[PDB]
Write a protein that binds this ligand. Structure first.
Ligand SMILES: *C(=O)CC[C@H](NC(=O)CC[C@H](NC(=O)CCCCCCCCCCCCCCC)C(=O)O)C(=O)O
Length: 29
């Protein structure tokens, strides 16, 4: 889907939604 808006418009989320919640615990121990 959105083969034209599924990549570019997908580089400003995981790297903050899959990194924040993550790196949020990784550094909590
Ligand atoms: C996020 O779900 C994908 C959104 C992304 N594009 C944008 O961030 C901007 C367009 C808009 N996005 C938003 O406003 C935020 C949407 C959040 C919805 C989250 C629901 C859960 C889905 C999780 C999917 C896995 C993604 C990795 C997260 C660990 C929009 O939604 O269109 C895009 O590429 O669509």
């Amino acid at each position: 889907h959105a083969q034209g808006t599924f990549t570019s418009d997908y580089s400003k989320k995981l790297d903050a939604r899959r990194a924040q919640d993550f790196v949020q615990w990784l550094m909590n121990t």
